Design a protein around this ligand. Structure first.
Ligand SMILES: *[C@@H]1O[C@H](CO)[C@@H](O[C@@H]2O[C@H](CO)[C@@H](O[C@@H]3O[C@H](CO)[C@@H](O)[C@H](O[C@H]4O[C@H](CO)[C@@H](O)[C@H](O)[C@@H]4O)[C@@H]3O)[C@H](O)[C@H]2NC(C)=O)[C@H](O)[C@H]1NC(C)=O
Ligand SMILES: *[C@@H]1O[C@H](CO)[C@@H](O[C@@H]2O[C@H](CO)[C@@H](O[C@@H]3O[C@H](CO)[C@@H](O)[C@H](O[C@H]4O[C@H](CO)[C@@H](O)[C@H](O)[C@@H]4O)[C@@H]3O)[C@H](O)[C@H]2NC(C)=O)[C@H](O)[C@H]1NC(C)=O
Ligand SMILES: *[C@@H]1O[C@H](CO)[C@@H](O[C@@H]2O[C@H](CO)[C@@H](O)[C@H](O)[C@H]2NC(C)=O)[C@H](O)[C@H]1NC(C)=O
Ligand SMILES: *[C@@H]1O[C@H](CO)[C@@H](O)[C@H](O)[C@H]1NC(C)=O
Ligand SMILES: *[C@@H]1O[C@H](CO)[C@@H](O)[C@H](O)[C@H]1NC(C)=O
Ligand SMILES: *[C@@H]1O[C@H](CO)[C@@H](O)[C@H](O)[C@H]1NC(C)=O
Ligand SMILES: *[C@@H]1O[C@H](CO)[C@@H](O)[C@H](O)[C@H]1NC(C)=O
Ligand SMILES: *[C@@H]1O[C@H](CO)[C@@H](O)[C@H](O)[C@H]1NC(C)=O
Ligand SMILES: *[C@@H]1O[C@H](CO)[C@@H](O)[C@H](O)[C@H]1NC(C)=O
Ligand SMILES: *[C@@H]1O[C@H](CO)[C@@H](O)[C@H](O)[C@H]1NC(C)=O
Ligand SMILES: *[C@@H]1O[C@H](CO)[C@@H](O)[C@H](O)[C@H]1NC(C)=O
Ligand SMILES: *[C@@H]1O[C@H](CO)[C@@H](O)[C@H](O)[C@H]1NC(C)=O
Ligand SMILES: *[C@@H]1O[C@H](CO)[C@@H](O)[C@H](O)[C@H]1NC(C)=O
Ligand SMILES: *[C@@H]1O[C@H](CO)[C@@H](O)[C@H](O)[C@H]1NC(C)=O
Ligand SMILES: *[C@@H]1O[C@H](CO)[C@@H](O)[C@H](O)[C@H]1NC(C)=O
Ligand SMILES: *[C@@H]1O[C@H](CO)[C@@H](O)[C@H](O)[C@H]1NC(C)=O
Ligand SMILES: *[C@@H]1O[C@H](CO)[C@@H](O)[C@H](O)[C@H]1NC(C)=O
Ligand SMILES: *[C@@H]1O[C@H](CO)[C@@H](O)[C@H](O)[C@H]1NC(C)=O
Ligand SMILES: *[C@@H]1O[C@H](CO)[C@@H](O)[C@H](O)[C@H]1NC(C)=O
Ligand SMILES: *[C@@H]1O[C@H](CO)[C@@H](O)[C@H](O)[C@H]1NC(C)=O
Ligand SMILES: *[C@@H]1O[C@H](CO)[C@@H](O)[C@H](O)[C@H]1NC(C)=O
Ligand SMILES: *[C@@H]1O[C@H](CO)[C@@H](O)[C@H](O)[C@H]1NC(C)=O
Ligand SMILES: *[C@@H]1O[C@H](CO)[C@@H](O)[C@H](O)[C@H]1NC(C)=O
Ligand SMILES: *[C@@H]1O[C@H](CO)[C@@H](O)[C@H](O)[C@H]1NC(C)=O
Ligand SMILES: *[C@@H]1O[C@H](CO)[C@@H](O)[C@H](O)[C@H]1NC(C)=O
Ligand SMILES: *[C@@H]1O[C@H](CO)[C@@H](O)[C@H](O)[C@H]1NC(C)=O
Ligand SMILES: *[C@@H]1O[C@H](CO)[C@@H](O)[C@H](O)[C@H]1NC(C)=O
Ligand SMILES: *[C@@H]1O[C@H](CO)[C@@H](O)[C@H](O)[C@H]1NC(C)=O
Lengths: 123, 106, 106, 432, 126, 122, 438
């Protein structure tokens, strides 16, 4: 389907093409703009990688967490998310709750979890 | 940051619209909150973030302002709104409060 | 004014001899001493600045040390080019002062 | 047994020198203002040194660069280094102003490259020098490149916020008694500094920050006679400066769309520029300064204030830009007292149009005349003083001229540090 | 805000400050005038990647707290766990251990992960 | 010993210096250095992205579940690890490098991660 | 049961063309913009690594040439322009204590130029070299190409002394150095090492003779793109230096004449003492021994019974017909007909080379640009060593070959130093079969 070809696909079907989009995140007048474009692409790629690192998701495109889903973020069932919705619609639905989820992923795992692994690997 | 709140002796009727304002000695963006203290009672937080209202507080209260210039507007001053109101910044440590505006019943 | 006592006022040495010149100050100059060599008829040549930093172009034969109020200039081997009047100078404040000057003769 | 455990995200930092970027609300800066928010570093005591603060050298370098990039596209006054035929202006001249302004005629090239026209302009005495006869030339017009400032570009200082690159942080000293060096027990981390106005002045620090509690005396080495003393006031002293003359601007075309803006004439009386300060407020302010100076020089030491011993006009007078005009005010009436253990003080001011800012070789700027009457009010928030040195009496005089000492008076509570997120420490946790 | 709480634990003990590792991590990455800005942005990127590369080499990629197989040498610091984790901050620790930091890093590379990966290559082999 | 010191060594012996080469990939006259720094970063990140999408993030030696096809090279292990250098190997299989990379992307991430996604429930 | 194993940090590289930067331990080449060098550079021998080198397609030469041009242009950009001097000159001969050879070489030229004020003009004088002046038609003269080239005065404070430049690779790239003492510029190099940066290469600009720089480790090297093609240059690298002592014996003064607001034109003023011709000396024995070595090496490609003749340049630009160089800011054009004048048939004292001096030069053969070299006060003496030659063969196929000096393409000067280096890119990621299964 190529880059963003799954944009109109359901979230489930679109989740099997994650590498297609991942491969396209890195790659006087017209000289300066080219360098700025290169630096911006690198900074945004790394911002996403930094967040994956903080959440304990480094090196993975699909990462499972220890943060439960709060029904106030969305009360839809799985058949109404993965089978009957696209990722653009989902992003529209989860907007006000993105920072809450990110804060919980940062606090509830890879921080408390790493201290717990630090203690478990102690014995 | 020093906070100056004025007027300190506001009075109004039970049906009037009132505005209580304050000034920061330094700009504090929107890092400001408003509190309500009934005599003999715990202060209640009304507004945080300058413009944000807390759950449990009616839409009757509204905040506005930025930088150094902040205000609290009460669209209709009901009998339960005659209290000492406080202006508080949390932009820089320590937290500081204004002297308070005591709203009186004419 | 910070006064400078330089000793000996006159020193006699031959070629290859080790020569030490002491400058004692009336007040602490915080290692702000310079050493100069003045040949007859010429402006003084800077030898050492900031107590022990050697001026580029001056041979390693010249070395300085000291602290507080007592500083020393050491010439490891007196050569034929090293005769003349040696001065100490302090730049710790104003006025800048010079010592009496020690003449190194044959 | 203990094992090495690696931590990432460790709150550790080392002193560092790095290029800072500017937040604002020019185009060389970042728009949208910085966030004022600061994080208090509880139990963190950090050593500061305002005299080794690299932020001052960058602010100085950046202010000079912004100046140079502001004058570069403006008209260069190269065809004006010609013989001037100058006579005195005798129209409504007060006693002070006789000889200060001259009516100078010269032959200027018109827009046509093959034609000349006779024009005239008024110049201040300080801007012209004799040739030998009425023959005068613009001061240093043959030894420096004089560039005319664009009249549409304002010289009003706008606060600039200095911000750390990511991976760096700016630590702020919150200790109200911080004297510029040593440990600061109350420190917070910020992304950007407060809005620092790029005010250019000598002797008196204008439109700066005030001391939180009491007047601060800060010096690199108070016992070193050759160092400057920065005095930070805890109350402002208001100074009202004016250019009472009603001036006109005479636009003389010199090139293909390039105009020279000359003083045309003066409407009404010609009077000297001057500044007023309240006499009582100034005397109270000096009493506070003396109180603080005696803490270093002795309770029984007589503190004398005197005027500048000499030097460039920029440092013998109080130099400042008031409404686009460059004032050189005589402060001998301000620093004239002996302190033993309402009315106003009026300071005459000279005005110049040819400014050699930063004392560079081969460069000068011409300030276009400002039409009308100028009146600015500034707050004096500090002094730059020097001591005469070599008993029982100390004499303090106004100093300055090095703008770093002005920036340094604002950038004294900040330092830039580098964040070191990695660290190792012993724990009992073993891999596998 | 991402900046909120940045370095708040700097004066806290090493144990307490170890609970804020994401707060100081999330703020590390984000004409000559233009060139100066590009150099600052590139430098922030280069420093981030150098620290992540070191974590990779040590086998600690993606971790904020990483346990190793390098024994602690009493010549580096002879303090006990109470003195280090309960009675000391990370700035004080860094000042004490900076003389041994390159030795420790050298061991993290030479004494473990180069040997651990070569052994894991042989355990997944059977 | 040293950066590229093992370049003339056999693949086996050369596999012991992966950190020696890896640590040297990150580290008029003004814009050339900025472009050189950006180029070094982009090349580094492209290689790290490939390691990530293959499930090899944070590793210098990474074992996979992709079988070796004898059509890519029919040499035994002795003639690859003990009697060959990495420059010779790189030359010998350059024609199949993208095929291998595609297989690594397909089976070492897309299939493996969905399988792990399902094993975390059952 | 073999599986694909991914390795990162693999010692593999491929040829690459990238941007190199500089390191160095004000000047024209803006060496203050270079990074500091490694206090202890790490040259790592790549044992059992044989690499193919080709000095003739080496992209480091084109990149260094480009850097030299750009540095030159930004160095002169802020300096005083000399467009006000493209005026009629009234020139007479200098007759003050002039030798028989310095007759007509230096002209005392007067002209009307503005002074401190824009309206006031003064009659000013300068002493110009004959080569910098072209007749207008009666004593009326003008500066050479003053109306066809923009002459820029070099800043007297920016040194022309070559400072070593170390070319450094971006991270992820490496420079490979050829350690084969007999490497002839192309083909396999069985002894290769990898370096962080090149050695310090001085950007010495000269023709015919290569001054300063690297010597051959064992014997004189004859390197050419195609030795059988007589249209190609031959780069001769010496194993022993030949010392050349060059001087500008006149005691010159600098007459600073105001040309603009804070801008001065620097004229040669007057000469103190007498006026003698500039010259260079080489030892006859050292030069003859050096040519004997060159001939012995040329016979390896030309025949052991072939007569090797040296001759002077057949003609061309002054920069090519003479030995062009810069000593202390003065530009010398030395007649090498006394150096390349011999016939070698198979079987103490010194050579003085007359030199001319120019102030208006055009380096890199650019159209519309020229530089005025300001006068250097006093007397110039410089001692340089010759580390190689640029020769061209007459060919024309005879039992005799004739070699003449050549030059003018400075790439050949850089190439003579950047011959043992190539830039490669590192390919740290690779795959190989193992029995290890995930
Ligand atoms: C220290 O701080 C004081 C207090 O702010 C500051 O004084 C202020 O300076 C500004 C700038 O000069 C003054 O504003 C000017 O007022 C005059 C009055 O007529 C105007 O003509 C000016 O307008 C000019 O620029 C406009 C730009 O759009 C043009 O449209 C216009 O035609 C003019 O060219 C300008 O508005 C202000 O009045 C004073 N205020 C006081 C109380 O003095 C002082 O400058 C600071 N000093 C230093 C050294 O930083
Ligand atoms: C090959 O290398 C040799 C050896 O380095 C080199 O010869 C050297 O040239 C320099 C450049 O002129 C000489 O140094 C000068 O010496 C004179 C002596 O009168 C000084 O006056 C010069 O100082 C002036 O210029 C300086 C420029 O930086 C100023 O800083 C200074 O204030 C003066 O204005 C300058 O020091 C040096 O003496 C020779 N070396 C020898 C051994 O002769 C040669 O040029 C190189 N080959 C080529 C073709 O360039
Ligand atoms: C700042 O220092 C105080 C004083 O040591 C720390 O608080 C003490 O120590 C622990 C908590 O760290 C408590 O058990 C004590 O009761 C505290 N006593 C007092 C008097 O504070 C405090 O934790 C530190 N705070 C930070 C943010 O580092
Ligand atoms: C678009 O929707 C149709 C069904 O309406 C579906 O078959 C098709 O796969 C969708 N396109 C994509 C790209 O998923
Ligand atoms: C999910 O919820 C929707 C909305 O009520 C419902 O129509 C649908 O049948 C549900 N599906 C499942 C599998 O529970
Ligand atoms: C966020 O809340 C606003 C109301 O405050 C709402 O309009 C918007 O749809 C919400 N965002 C979502 C559902 O993504
Ligand atoms: C100055 O001189 C000019 C003549 O050049 C005259 O027209 C003008 O009125 C004079 N102005 C003053 C102020 O004297
Ligand atoms: C500043 O305070 C430090 C405290 O250690 C003191 O040593 C120093 O003398 C003070 N300097 C001035 C100028 O007050
Ligand atoms: C200063 O004070 C004098 C008092 O006589 C007054 O005449 C003058 O107008 C004042 N000027 C300013 C600028 O305040
Ligand atoms: C300056 O002007 C203000 C306002 O016009 C006035 O109140 C004050 O008295 C004047 N003098 C001083 C010294 O501020
Ligand atoms: C300083 O004051 C003296 C009088 O004590 C005076 O003669 C001199 O001109 C003054 N200098 C300045 C720069 O004000
Ligand atoms: C200084 O003060 C004295 C009185 O103590 C006075 O006579 C004199 O005029 C003053 N000088 C200046 C320059 O203000
Ligand atoms: C200056 O004089 C002009 C004369 O036309 C007058 O209109 C204007 O109001 C005056 N302005 C000031 C500031 O005195
Ligand atoms: C100076 O400080 C006073 C403090 O009361 C303030 O009101 C005023 O706006 C400030 N600025 C000026 C120009 O006076
Ligand atoms: C600890 O370090 C010392 C040197 O600091 C070394 O001699 C000793 O062998 C080391 N011991 C261990 C167990 O690492
Ligand atoms: C750690 O060492 C300290 C000495 O400062 C001692 O007082 C404490 O009891 C020790 N604690 C343990 C657990 O060894
Ligand atoms: C680190 O080593 C230096 C000498 O290089 C020494 O002066 C210092 O005291 C040492 N610090 C520690 C904490 O070991
Ligand atoms: C080079 O080859 C020889 C001969 O096989 C071998 O002994 C030596 O270890 C090799 N060295 C390297 C660095 O490859
Ligand atoms: C190996 O590759 C060939 C083509 O190169 C292909 O036909 C064959 O199916 C592959 N076999 C395996 C086991 O991958
Ligand atoms: C692998 O093949 C080669 C053929 O070139 C053979 O010589 C060698 O012995 C084989 N290795 C093993 C381990 O069988
Ligand atoms: C000339 O070559 C010799 C080699 O014997 C070297 O020592 C000397 O420094 C060289 N001269 C210059 C100017 O490089
Ligand atoms: C350089 O050496 C190669 C070796 O293959 C040879 O073919 C070539 O002819 C040589 N060229 C010259 C100019 O000696
Ligand atoms: C060259 O040789 C001649 C010998 O005839 C000598 O007099 C002259 O000074 C020499 N000049 C130089 C520059 O070596
Ligand atoms: C050049 O000629 C001028 C007059 O034309 C004369 O004054 C000057 O001395 C001459 N200079 C020389 C060097 O001949
Ligand atoms: C060059 O001059 C030096 C002394 O400055 C002398 O020793 C050397 O022999 C000379 N060389 C030649 C080739 O004349
Ligand atoms: C070359 O030498 C001949 C004499 O053999 C001479 O006539 C000619 O002018 C010389 N040419 C050059 C360029 O030196
Ligand atoms: C060349 O050498 C011959 C002697 O073999 C001599 O007569 C002639 O003058 C020389 N020519 C030059 C240009 O040096
Ligand atoms: C040039 O002549 C002047 C005459 O005053 C003399 O002082 C100077 O030393 C001479 N310079 C040289 C390099 O001969």
């Amino acid at each position: 389907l190529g880059f963003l070809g799954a944009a109109g696909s359901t979230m489930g079907a679109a989740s099997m093409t994650l590498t297609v989009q991942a491969r396209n995140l890195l790659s006087t007048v017209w000289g300066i703009k080219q360098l700025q474009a290169r630096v911006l692409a690198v900074e945004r790629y790394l911002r996403d990688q930094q967040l994956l690192g903080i959440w304990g998701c480094s090196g993975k495109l699909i990462c499972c967490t220890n943060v439960p889903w709060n029904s106030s973020w969305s009360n839809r069932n799985l058949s109404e998310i993965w089978d009957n919705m696209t990722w653009l619609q989902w992003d529209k639905e989860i907007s006000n709750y993105t920072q809450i989820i990110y804060g919980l992923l940062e606090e509830s795992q890879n921080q408390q979890e790493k201290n717990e692994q630090d203690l478990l690997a102690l014995d | 940051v020093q906070m100056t709140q004025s007027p300190s002796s506001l009075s109004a009727s039970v049906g009037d619209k009132v505005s209580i304002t304050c000034r920061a000695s330094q700009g504090i963006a929107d890092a400001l909150a408003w509190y309500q203290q009934k005599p003999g009672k715990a202060p209640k937080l009304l507004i945080y973030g300058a413009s944000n209202l807390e759950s449990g507080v009616p839409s009757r209260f509204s905040g506005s302002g930025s930088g150094t210039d902040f205000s609290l507007t009460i669209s209709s001053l009901q009998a339960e709104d005659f209290a000492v109101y406080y202006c508080q910044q949390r932009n820089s440590h320590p937290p500081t409060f204004g002297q308070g505006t005591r709203v009186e019943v004419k | 004014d910070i006064q400078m006592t330089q000793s000996p006022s006159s020193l006699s040495a031959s070629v290859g001899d080790r020569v030490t010149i002491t400058c004692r100050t009336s007040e602490n100059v915080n290692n702000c001493l310079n050493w100069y060599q003045q040949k007859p008829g010429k402006a003084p040549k800077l030898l050492i600045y900031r107590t022990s930093t050697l001026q580029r172009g001056v041979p390693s034969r010249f070395s300085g040390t000291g602290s507080g109020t007592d500083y020393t200039l050491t010439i490891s081997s007196l050569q034929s080019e090293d005769f003349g009047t040696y001065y100490c100078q302090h730049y710790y404040g104003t006025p800048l002062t010079f010592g009496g000057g020690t003449m190194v003769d044959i | 047994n203990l094992w090495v455990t690696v931590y990432y995200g460790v709150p550790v930092w080392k002193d560092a020198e790095t290029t800072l970027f500017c937040a604002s609300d020019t185009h060389a800066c970042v728009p949208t203002d910085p966030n004022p928010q600061e994080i208090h570093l509880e139990n963190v005591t950090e050593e500061f040194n305002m005299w080794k603060n690299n932020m001052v050298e960058q602010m100085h370098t950046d202010i000079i660069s912004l100046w140079d990039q502001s004058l570069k596209p403006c008209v260069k006054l190269t065809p004006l280094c010609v013989t001037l035929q100058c006579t005195n202006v005798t129209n409504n001249i007060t006693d002070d102003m006789r000889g200060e302004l001259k009516n100078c005629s010269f032959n200027m090239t018109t827009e046509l490259r093959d034609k000349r026209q006779k024009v005239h302009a008024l110049f201040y005495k300080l801007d012209i020098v004799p040739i030998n006869n009425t023959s005068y030339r613009l001061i240093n017009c043959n030894t420096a490149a004089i560039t005319q400032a664009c009249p549409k570009v304002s010289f009003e200082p706008i606060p600039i916020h200095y911000c750390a690159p990511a991976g760096f942080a700016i630590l702020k000293c919150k200790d109200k008694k911080f004297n510029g060096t040593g440990p600061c027990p109350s420190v917070s981390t910020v992304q950007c500094t407060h809005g620092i106005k790029p005010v250019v002045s000598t002797q008196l620090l204008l439109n700066g920050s005030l001391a939180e509690e009491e007047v601060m005396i800060r010096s690199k080495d108070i016992r070193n006679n050759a160092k400057n003393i920065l005095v930070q006031f805890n109350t402002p002293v208001q100074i009202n400066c004016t250019r009472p003359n009603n001036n006109t601007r005479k636009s003389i075309r010199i090139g293909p769309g390039q105009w020279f803006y000359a003083t045309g004439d003066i409407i009404g009386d010609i009077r000297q520029a001057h500044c007023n300060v309240s006499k009582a407020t100034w005397n109270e302010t000096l009493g506070k300064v003396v109180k603080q100076l005696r803490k270093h020089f002795g309770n029984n030491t007589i503190i004398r204030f005197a005027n500048s011993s000499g030097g460039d006009l920029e440092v013998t007078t109080h130099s400042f830009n008031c409404g686009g005009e460059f004032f050189y005010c005589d402060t001998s009436g301000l620093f004239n007292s002996t302190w033993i253990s309402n009315d106003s003080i009026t300071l005459p001011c000279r005005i110049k149009q040819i400014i050699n800012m930063w004392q560079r070789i081969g460069q000068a700027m011409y300030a276009p005349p400002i039409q009308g009457v100028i009146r600015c009010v500034s707050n004096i928030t500090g002094l730059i003083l020097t001591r005469d040195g070599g008993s029982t009496t100390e004499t303090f005089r106004p100093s300055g001229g090095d703008m770093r000492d002005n920036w340094r008076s604002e950038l004294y509570k900040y330092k830039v540090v580098k964040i070191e997120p990695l660290g190792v420490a012993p724990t009992r946790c073993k891999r596998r």
